[PDB]
Amino acid sequence: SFIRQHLRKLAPYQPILPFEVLSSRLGRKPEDIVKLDANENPYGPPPEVMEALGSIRFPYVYPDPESRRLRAALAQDSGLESEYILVGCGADELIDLIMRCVLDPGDKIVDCPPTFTMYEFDAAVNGALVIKVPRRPDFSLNVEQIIEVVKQEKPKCIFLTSPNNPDGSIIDDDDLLKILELPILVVLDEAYIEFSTIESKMSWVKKHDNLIVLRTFSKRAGLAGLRVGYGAFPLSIIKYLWRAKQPYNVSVAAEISACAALQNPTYLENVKDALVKERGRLFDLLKAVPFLKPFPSHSNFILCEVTSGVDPKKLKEDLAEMGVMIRHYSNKELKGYVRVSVGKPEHTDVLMNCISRLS
Amino acid sequence: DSFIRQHLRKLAPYQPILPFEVLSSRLGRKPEDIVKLDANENPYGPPPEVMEALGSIRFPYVYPDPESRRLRAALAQDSGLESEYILVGCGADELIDLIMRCVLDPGDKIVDCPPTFTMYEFDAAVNGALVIKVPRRPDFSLNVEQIIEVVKQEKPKCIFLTSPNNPDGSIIDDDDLLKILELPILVVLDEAYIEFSTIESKMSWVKKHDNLIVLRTFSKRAGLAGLRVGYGAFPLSIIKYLWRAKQPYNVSVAAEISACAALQNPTYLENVKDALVKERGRLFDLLKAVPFLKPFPSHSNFILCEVTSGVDPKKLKEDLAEMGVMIRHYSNKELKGYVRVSVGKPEHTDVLMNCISRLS
Ligand SMILES: *[C@H](N[C@H](COP(=O)(O)O)Cc1c[nH]cn1)c1c(COP(=O)(O)O)cnc(C)c1O
Ligand SMILES: Cc1ncc(COP(=O)(O)O)c(CN[C@H](COP(=O)(O)O)Cc2c[nH]cn2)c1O
Ligand code: NA
Ligand code: NA
């Protein structure tokens, strides 16, 4: 085989399926499926987006390789100069790009599960070796053990999600600053920060040349399908990433949609506020379910430990049969939980109705 | 001193081109007053079904199908090849890079046959592979006897072969391709421009050659370069592993929707292809009459010219840009002596020739 040896036993990522595919499999129209498994924004993007997408002037022309219009808009949005900002085909592209540019095969990376499964997946694809330092029972980082493995094994980078996926807890500044004192590249993933009251740390990259901060349009801004994310990078790192990055992965539709979304700050704030409001209602409803233990969250989702002998995978599959999709991941660190995205109030109501009829 | 991998600290960047909105600002001209013939884009745009579909996307806020299965079903119908052999990429660019990422360890070797598409050498450098060059012959044909000899000597993992080639447009004949396929190497045949030729696609060959991959795109004939959607035919023993290593969601909803829509209008696709083939012949004869340009025959939607008579090819390209016409010049050893002119509308050719006369 021509395939690289380390890929021959790669464990694949476990993606989820969209409405058009779910319809065929569940026997339901898309409008008759409640989809709470990928932290998507059920309100969709501001109306400016579909107006812009239906009037793209140059679909036949390659996109701007420098995404300079969006980066100017992001400099306005973030307060960080555009020289520090890269745009990616989702935050996913930037996670992978960082690893491709920093990790030689055999280099080590620290991961803190339970967390976003793409870090371990991307490390495996790139031939890096993962050092797992598990989070504490309250999902907080074990900084003492992070420091120890960093001293002992000299990993090159660590990814840290805040608000974390899948539980939604936030990393306190002092923990992050303690890790930034180490000779390691820290990538702070702020994919869900808009659902919190915490300020983005994008500006910190000007004071820490071993910090990257990642963001996305996929969740709050309702553009998951168009694939557009971004990040703040130290100038000493971004100069090399520019040279190694693929020229045209950010499509014209991605750039146009993100710029259009930013033109409606009132819509973006209102949908965010609606989702934050429903998060509290959903939490209280799930807490009353005898076999679910929800955790507090600053994101647009709620993690539930499944208790009382209930099979968490079967719970997820049973709800899917009933027309409601929630997230279950089959690996050792996550298989005991289910993760419920925050949707419209009527989506929560359907979910709780289905839960009440289980078994 | 730096977190960046050592081999990337010396990387030569790719030289991309700029879109109309950036050109307008840089040149001080409206886009309608800029003639853009530097990236093999289709000036007619995609079939009208595409902008209709893009304006009515139902679920922009939902992740796309990680398996792009609706488009792959349509591509199976279009190509006659079963969908299990077909991958969809964020442009053919994604598939070129994906192949290299899955097949080349650092230090592994790839054969390249310049002058050709510069992304092969760029992607090889980014992935830490070693490029083994077998230059094409003076008529741009492959040197099969040298490819055979170098494969035995260097034991490379793969070879990329463009047909119609970028930047000259010549085609690889079946016997040369078959001889190369007998070698212990992965052969990637890049058919990005095949629709502008009279040659049939070889996607079906991957069912009998498990060391052949065939790449295609919607960016050129189908007018979807900005939406980023390409595809390829892969042996089942290779595709199984590419599926596992591929990023889940790089093919956007807009990419899948636009490509499916384009395929609903075969008449439009044929008519714009025929208009571009017709203008290719007219453009060739006009360029041939320019004393300091030597155009080469082409089966694609572009014409390569050797710049002769002591004329600076880079300055020619930059002077034309100052007049509002963009053609391709690439600054590397094998390509710097040429300019490449994409085939546009007849009126685009006419502006180009006016500007050439004003330099001459
Ligand atoms: C968005 N993650 C989403 C949920 O994935 P999962 O936790 O259920 O496995 C969807 C996704 C996207 N790629 C893989 N899964 C996300 C991203 C990336 O979002 P974009 O690429 O769309 O910008 C990055 N970082 C985090 C923490 C999350 O949750
Ligand atoms: C032989 C060949 N195979 C694949 C692609 C990629 O097509 P996609 O499906 O990804 O759109 C191209 C496109 N080449 C264009 C001219 O590039 P140029 O020759 O350097 O001027 C534009 C481009 C895209 N990426 C870098 N350049 C090509 O010619
Ligand atoms: Na409970
Ligand atoms: Na001539």
mmCIF file of N, CA, C and O in Angstrom, chain A residues 1 7 10 18 27 56 65 68 81 85 104 134 162 178 198 200 219 222 264 300-301 310 331 341 353:
data_model
loop_
_atom_site.group_PDB
_atom_site.id
_atom_site.type_symbol
_atom_site.label_atom_id
_atom_site.label_comp_id
_atom_site.label_asym_id
_atom_site.label_seq_id
_atom_site.Cartn_x
_atom_site.Cartn_y
_atom_site.Cartn_z
ATOM 1 N N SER A 1 0.825 -1.203 0.000
ATOM 2 C CA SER A 1 0.000 0.000 0.000
ATOM 3 C C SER A 1 0.864 1.261 0.000
ATOM 4 O O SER A 1 1.951 1.283 0.575
ATOM 5 N N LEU A 7 -1.140 5.949 9.289
ATOM 6 C CA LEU A 7 -2.547 6.099 8.943
ATOM 7 C C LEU A 7 -3.274 4.768 8.831
ATOM 8 O O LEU A 7 -4.506 4.752 8.782
ATOM 9 N N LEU A 10 -5.428 4.422 11.878
ATOM 10 C CA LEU A 10 -6.063 5.635 12.377
ATOM 11 C C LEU A 10 -7.521 5.379 12.745
ATOM 12 O O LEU A 10 -8.275 4.792 11.966
ATOM 13 N N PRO A 18 -26.489 15.670 8.234
ATOM 14 C CA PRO A 18 -27.360 16.834 8.076
ATOM 15 C C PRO A 18 -28.822 16.448 7.857
ATOM 16 O O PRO A 18 -29.168 15.276 7.720
ATOM 17 N N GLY A 27 -37.214 8.786 8.277
ATOM 18 C CA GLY A 27 -38.559 8.794 7.734
ATOM 19 C C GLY A 27 -39.347 10.035 8.078
ATOM 20 O O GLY A 27 -40.578 9.979 8.170
ATOM 21 N N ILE A 56 -24.125 36.674 -5.331
ATOM 22 C CA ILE A 56 -22.678 36.607 -5.522
ATOM 23 C C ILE A 56 -22.353 36.985 -6.958
ATOM 24 O O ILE A 56 -22.819 36.340 -7.904
ATOM 25 N N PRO A 65 -7.051 35.081 -1.692
ATOM 26 C CA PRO A 65 -6.241 34.198 -0.841
ATOM 27 C C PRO A 65 -5.921 34.799 0.517
ATOM 28 O O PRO A 65 -5.593 34.057 1.450
ATOM 29 N N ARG A 68 -8.960 39.537 2.752
ATOM 30 C CA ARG A 68 -8.604 40.803 3.389
ATOM 31 C C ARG A 68 -9.827 41.621 3.796
ATOM 32 O O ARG A 68 -9.770 42.340 4.803
ATOM 33 N N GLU A 81 -5.370 44.196 15.404
ATOM 34 C CA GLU A 81 -4.933 44.513 14.050
ATOM 35 C C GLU A 81 -5.022 43.294 13.134
ATOM 36 O O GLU A 81 -4.780 42.156 13.544
ATOM 37 N N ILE A 85 -4.472 38.194 12.202
ATOM 38 C CA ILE A 85 -5.694 37.420 12.014
ATOM 39 C C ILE A 85 -5.599 36.564 10.763
ATOM 40 O O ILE A 85 -5.311 37.066 9.669
ATOM 41 N N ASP A 104 6.323 17.830 13.863
ATOM 42 C CA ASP A 104 6.921 16.762 13.081
ATOM 43 C C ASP A 104 6.351 15.427 13.557
ATOM 44 O O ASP A 104 5.970 15.293 14.724
ATOM 45 N N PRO A 134 -6.030 14.272 32.014
ATOM 46 C CA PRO A 134 -7.479 14.411 32.188
ATOM 47 C C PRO A 134 -7.852 15.600 33.052
ATOM 48 O O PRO A 134 -7.151 15.961 34.002
ATOM 49 N N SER A 162 -12.253 26.780 25.782
ATOM 50 C CA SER A 162 -12.946 27.554 26.804
ATOM 51 C C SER A 162 -13.916 28.545 26.171
ATOM 52 O O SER A 162 -13.475 29.464 25.474
ATOM 53 N N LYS A 178 -0.471 30.464 33.897
ATOM 54 C CA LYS A 178 0.511 29.505 34.392
ATOM 55 C C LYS A 178 0.991 28.589 33.272
ATOM 56 O O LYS A 178 2.184 28.283 33.178
ATOM 57 N N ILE A 198 -17.574 36.142 29.247
ATOM 58 C CA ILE A 198 -16.123 36.287 29.315
ATOM 59 C C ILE A 198 -15.639 37.007 28.065
ATOM 60 O O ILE A 198 -16.130 36.751 26.961
ATOM 61 N N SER A 200 -13.125 37.859 25.021
ATOM 62 C CA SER A 200 -12.174 37.125 24.199
ATOM 63 C C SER A 200 -10.755 37.536 24.564
ATOM 64 O O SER A 200 -10.488 38.698 24.879
ATOM 65 N N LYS A 219 -21.268 28.790 15.029
ATOM 66 C CA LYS A 219 -22.187 28.513 16.113
ATOM 67 C C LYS A 219 -23.069 29.735 16.305
ATOM 68 O O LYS A 219 -24.171 29.799 15.730
ATOM 69 N N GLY A 222 -24.377 31.245 13.011
ATOM 70 C CA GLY A 222 -25.232 30.457 12.142
ATOM 71 C C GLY A 222 -24.670 30.120 10.777
ATOM 72 O O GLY A 222 -25.441 29.977 9.821
ATOM 73 N N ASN A 264 -25.028 42.790 10.904
ATOM 74 C CA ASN A 264 -26.255 42.765 11.702
ATOM 75 C C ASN A 264 -25.919 42.393 13.141
ATOM 76 O O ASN A 264 -26.295 41.321 13.633
ATOM 77 N N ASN A 300 -23.448 26.912 24.289
ATOM 78 C CA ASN A 300 -24.796 26.663 23.789
ATOM 79 C C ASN A 300 -25.124 25.169 23.824
ATOM 80 O O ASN A 300 -25.805 24.642 22.945
ATOM 81 N N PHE A 301 -24.644 24.475 24.852
ATOM 82 C CA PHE A 301 -24.978 23.068 25.033
ATOM 83 C C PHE A 301 -24.861 22.708 26.504
ATOM 84 O O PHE A 301 -24.217 23.412 27.291
ATOM 85 N N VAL A 310 -28.667 3.414 32.954
ATOM 86 C CA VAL A 310 -29.191 3.679 31.619
ATOM 87 C C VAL A 310 -28.039 3.651 30.623
ATOM 88 O O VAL A 310 -26.972 4.226 30.871
ATOM 89 N N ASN A 331 -15.981 7.014 22.493
ATOM 90 C CA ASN A 331 -14.613 6.763 22.926
ATOM 91 C C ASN A 331 -14.637 6.676 24.447
ATOM 92 O O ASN A 331 -15.650 6.965 25.090
ATOM 93 N N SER A 341 -27.507 20.127 22.615
ATOM 94 C CA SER A 341 -27.389 21.513 22.181
ATOM 95 C C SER A 341 -28.632 22.299 22.581
ATOM 96 O O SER A 341 -29.728 21.746 22.722
ATOM 97 N N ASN A 353 -40.551 15.853 25.729
ATOM 98 C CA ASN A 353 -41.653 14.950 25.417
ATOM 99 C C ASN A 353 -41.136 13.562 25.066
ATOM 100 O O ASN A 353 -41.673 12.552 25.528
#
